[PDB]
Symmetry: C6
Subunit: 323 residues, 6 copies
């Protein structure tokens, strides 16, 4: 059975392998040492023989690689080229100098080539390391995630009871504030019996507590709207989005209007009142909202969203919006 | 007479049979056992050797199928492929990894393939089982469908007297709350002499009480709007719209504005006040309302809709909106 | 003279005849008996060996035709096919399962084929019989058309004097409420010397009282707007429209703004205040009104329309709106 | 000099003559007798062997032509065909059954053919006869054109002193109320030294009083807007627009906003307050006003238009609006 | 050096000469005598053997040319044809009967041919003569340009100090009111050291007082927006526009919003409050203002424009708007 | 390592060199002497044998070049041609007489050719010289940059403490007021450990104080928006946008709404209150804000922008807006 599955998948595996293998190899060649480093949130290269690692504690560390033969334009470009092709894209010094793509295991990768870089010797690479660990919610309490709030104990209960009861909750903050990580922690409180459907650009969320679920991924020609539209034909009890980014904020808006079972998602915002604004803006970009009152969007989102958690850049909750 | 009808239809039957036969066979191969199971509302597969059946009572049951050969990728993919082709569509691992289609008897099927699913061994299938039984309205009363309401006895009369009079009534709730089932029950009260025209994505409504009627179906190239447009040229006394989903919401709006008698439909909403908002949003997506005041849509729908029943996830009426 | 007219028209007559003859024949084959029946307003078939005739008194009568060889899919399809071709259209079981067309004498016909019908044995046909008789206005009084109104005598004078003086009047109601029939009755009061131009989808209005007039018809590529635009270059004293349906409601709106000689038309509405709304909606669908205040349309229509007559489903006036 | 002008124009004259000659002949054949008739405003044919002449006094006279051979379909259709071709258009019983065109001397012609007319023996023709005479303003006073008004003497001075000063004046009424005729009369008051530019669909205005002027004409590909655009580059002192019909209404608006002196035009409206509304509607149809407040258009036109004369259907001024 | 410049330009000169030479010749043939006449502002021909010259004093003088062989359709058409081709255009009696173009030295020329003219013997030509002289501002004072104003002395100082200080000033009036001429006069007050960039359709402005400047011209495919956009990359201290006509009014609007060094321009308006309206209208026609409040444009223009000068048709300032 | 980098880049270098070498040579030929000149901000040529250098102190110096051969049309045009080609564009006397391009070292060049310039001997060239020096903020204080303000000492602290905290600050003024120069000075206050990403049309900003950073450049096909989009995927701590010009204004808006830390940019505006208006206008031009309240944009920008410095044309701060 695991036999005939291999034969059936042979042509696909071989095709996928033709890209993976060289990329895997290039990724190890350059960034092996760095990707091994523990408690890091980004690996950046700035086309000047120095690799900058952002640690979880917020400190940037540089490492000298002027000796490395792997930080040669040829070797670097090969890696770019490998990167690009893996996700069915191109990257050149003409009409495609900017690449968003991924490493073998899914980590996001931003590459920038001349003439967008200062010169033709300058290649920019940015890798976003996800949290490797799934921290339990009790750990968030113990390291004082909630300690900035007046309503600290009342909040801890809000999230636990809220989630268990199927409230619409939004975790917001800036890039690297640990929104994803926190989402993963609170899934503890969703009953084990509920059916969960996640929607992501990369695998990140884990299912330590639930047995019945399905992960959706958007990419290339498949948008997050396509995933969300699919998701609603898959009899979900919980929808976990992961990121509101663009267009889809209107679909998500219309899901709330039909009073769905318990939605959970993340967004880039600076506060509760900002969240409602980022949502209304993102939603208006969807042409299907062409005739909708922008104040009606904000008032709409205010009516439906039960709880907002905001995270400052020192990974602490500085706003716990309820109702 | 039933003779020359067969000869006339011979080419069509043969063409339809070329897809039905294999699909019928594949469906029995995989899901026969589960489709046999009584009092279920969804059959899900999560590409992990486990079949998850949602029961009427709201509990999810998993079944082990790691020994069943039918649950091999090749066999699964054949089924997927059979499914797609039956409704004149394609499903692949490139530009068509999401499918909405149907089984031989009309049950809705959602299939998702790699690279939307987490890996290339992971195939998602979701089948919505309709209610197999047509419950009499007296059964609804007895099992206390109305028992949450203050205005319980006053509502039971509102629905019976209102329907029989030709009021515009809307049943709303979440996926699986028993909207369709409830609609079918209250058709009892529409006089037996009234001509009914139904509009559906699949057969579901039944005509136990009426002799003069016609069922319409929207499919690939034919929209619900086309059906509603046709419907208003078939001298209907009652129009029954299984579901308001998208654009057609404006057409339905303009049917009400023309006075029409005895409209009856369902919708995904959380509450009465939500229903009017979901209606106004859905309507605005119709560009024929490009210049229409969104507050004028909501006030319009409020003027025209006579009754709204909302159903919570425990299959009970928690709001009976009147006038 | 009637000689050379025949020769000149020979090629056209022959071409038109190629469709008429077979359709005439098919129509007699199937519906001859029914079309003969007196005091009927619709003939429906529901693809189940039963022909349903709606009578003027509002009762649906069924007739068994399971014996008829003319209610065979082949014979039925031929008739559909004849129907379609007569009005330069197609009707199939793929991309054209819905047909709006007409019988030889103009009666509207709605045909619906699988896969919009429940199965491939099910063919839906709906024929709208016009009133065969031109009732005099005194007959409307005698059968108490106006008897529901408080202002009964004051209304009878409003319509008679109104019309004679060239007021803009609108008759509204639901399909089959006798709007057309009533229009035809009140033409009695338009002075015999006035030039009338009618605009219709089918011949229905008759000129018992006027000698100087011209009938326009919209169909296929020619819209009602084209007819109305033409109509205003034909030095009319009265414009009789017959139905406001879609786009044209704006042209009709602009005709009133130039204070025309006396307009008369019908619309599907449930009341006076509804009429103004159906008008404003229909008008906004015309792109030429893209920048027009929707409240300015309704207030515009209120300024111009002198009299609205609404007819309930028991063919009685339940609202006589003046000024 | 008149010699070499003929040789130069020889090819054009010959080409123009190929259409004129047959049309001239056909027109004389059918309508000679009626065109000879004095004090008529429309000649209509209703495809029923009767020619209906509207007289200046508002009475319709029918004439029997069932013996006239000229009123055979072949001969009628030849005339239609001649008509169409003269203005570089086609008229058929398929995609071009409506024609707007002109006779040799410019009179407007509307022709309608089957299947717009009731049957294939029915051809509609409508010819608008312009006033043949240029009545002096003193004749208008004597026959009591102003006699309905309270401010009768104060108006006669308003028109004479206002025109001579360069006010923006608008004559409005219904088709046939004598707007054109009245315009021509008041040109007496525009100083003889002023340069006048007229803009018309046909020749109608005459220059009894002015020596320095130029007439513009809009035709198939050339719009009234193009004429107005050109006009403002011909150093006009007075612009006379026979009619505001459609888009150009915005251009006329922007001429006023540039201050311009001595504008004079006509329009279809029922009253002064209607005139401002017909103007604002017509203007909004020009997409160059896509972002303009519709109440700002009406307030704009009210700020700029100095005088409005309205003419009822008994050729009398029933409103002389000032300031 | 002036040697190799000739050789380099030889091919261009020859090509330009092929059009100039014949046009120069035709222009002399027809209008030589008239173009010599001093103190004229327009030369018009009306296709009736009479040449009408508008003098500066506002009087139209006719001259008889029925004897001239140069006023022959052939000769006239040749001149039209020469005119057209000079500016890479065509002019015919079909799809190009209207021509805007220029004489050798730049004077604007409007030609109109049949069928826009009354007949095929009628050719319209309008030539706009610019002021040949650059009057000093002291001359404007002496002939009492400012004498109509209450704030006469206070105005003379406003313009002198205003301009010197770099205020945004607008000269408005009707065609031929001497807006350009007045602009040229007040350039006296712009410091000799400031860098000036002009933008025109034809050369008209002169630089008697400044040594550092550049003239831009719009024409054919190059718009005034392209010129203005260029102009802002040329390190101007003063921008002199000359005419606001259409689209560009929004660019000009955005130049003011960045608080530029001192803008000076002309517009066709009847007053200060009209100027703000013509500006807001013209600006809205620019699609880039699609979402901008029209009251926000007018209030925007009011905030930025420091001084408006309006000129009546007797070449006097009747409004000196400040602040 | 620097070895194989040369071999890898050999083809690109050679291709880039084919344009650089001639341009480098031409630039030295014409403008070498002037480019050498110290304390200049623009070098202009006005196609009249005179080179006009704008000095830092605001005085324009002319230089005679009528003897220099380099200032012949052929030589000038070669330079123009060299210029165009370097940035993959064309410049001609037909469809491309305006060029925006750059010299070898990045200085902006505007060239204008006939027929935009007054004649075919007239070539316009404008070169914007960046500040060559990176002045320390203490120099700004000493030369009294802040001395016009009431809140002088309170502002010096506002900029130093605000920057170091991550406030969103905007420097605005007119072309040449020293916005760029001032930005570079205050970068001193951004902590040395912060990762900076710059976005520019040319290199100008320098990194005297920071080790971890990456410069982005927008060019023909690559927009500033693309750079900003990329930037937000490179884990920036500070984003420095040399200039807000057009569409990207909305993207910048949505960066602020996501909370982001330490944004820093420049803009052309006259004052703080102008800045918010230029921002809201620029933003609205982005169609992604099609449905956004323009007063909501201005109120949005006011909520997010923490500090605004305005610089008058005498290189001094005349407005230090806070909160
Ligand atoms: O006859 C039926 O309806 C039926 C359905 C399902 C079924 O599934 C299971 C059960 C346990 C483990 C695995 N599969 C067995 C039998
Ligand atoms: O000479 C004319 O002007 C003339 C016009 C019309 C006319 O038409 C008639 C009259 C009656 C019956 C039939 N045709 C006869 C003569
Ligand atoms: O060495 C330099 O920097 C230099 C620059 C410019 C220059 O230009 C002049 C001066 C006067 C007349 C003409 N050209 C001469 C020398």
């Amino acid at each position: 059975l695991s036999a005939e599955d291999k034969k059936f998948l042979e042509v696909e595996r071989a095709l996928k392998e033709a890209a993976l293998n060289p990329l895997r190899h290039a990724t190890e060649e350059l960034f092996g040492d760095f990707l091994k480093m523990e408690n890091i949130t980004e690996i950046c290269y700035n086309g000047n023989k120095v690799v900058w690692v952002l640690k979880n504690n917020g400190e940037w560390q540089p490492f000298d690689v002027r000796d490395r033969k792997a930080f040669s334009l040829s070797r670097l470009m090969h890696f770019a080229r490998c990167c690009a092709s893996f996700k069915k894209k191109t990257i050149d010094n003409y009409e495609n100098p900017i690449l968003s793509s991924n490493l073998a295991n899914g980590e996001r990768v931003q590459i920038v080539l001349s003439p967008v870089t200062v010169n033709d010797e300058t290649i920019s690479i940015s890798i976003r390391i996800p949290s490797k660990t799934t921290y339990p919610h009790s750990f968030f309490e113990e390291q004082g995630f909630y300690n900035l709030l007046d309503n600290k104990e009342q909040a801890i209960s809000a999230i636990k009871d809220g989630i268990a009861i199927g409230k619409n909750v939004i975790v917001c903050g800036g890039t690297g504030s640990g929104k994803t990580t926190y989402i993963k922690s609170i899934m503890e409180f969703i009953p084990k019996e509920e059916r969960i459907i996640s929607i992501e650009d990369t695998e990140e969320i884990v299912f330590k507590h639930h047995k019945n679920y399905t992960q959706l991924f958007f990419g290339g020609n498949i948008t997050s709207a396509d995933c969300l539209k699919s998701c609603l034909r898959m009899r979900p009890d919980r929808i976990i989005l992961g990121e509101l980014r663009s267009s889809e904020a209107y679909d998500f808006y219309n899901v709330l209007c039909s009073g769905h079972k318990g939605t959970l998602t993340t967004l880039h915002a600076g506060s509760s009142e900002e969240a409602f604004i980022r949502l209304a803006n993102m939603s208006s970009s969807n042409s299907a909202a062409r005739n909708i009152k922008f104040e009606s969007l904000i008032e709409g989102f205010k009516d439906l969203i039960d709880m907002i958690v905001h995270i400052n850049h020192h990974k602490q909750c500085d706003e716990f919006y309820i109702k």
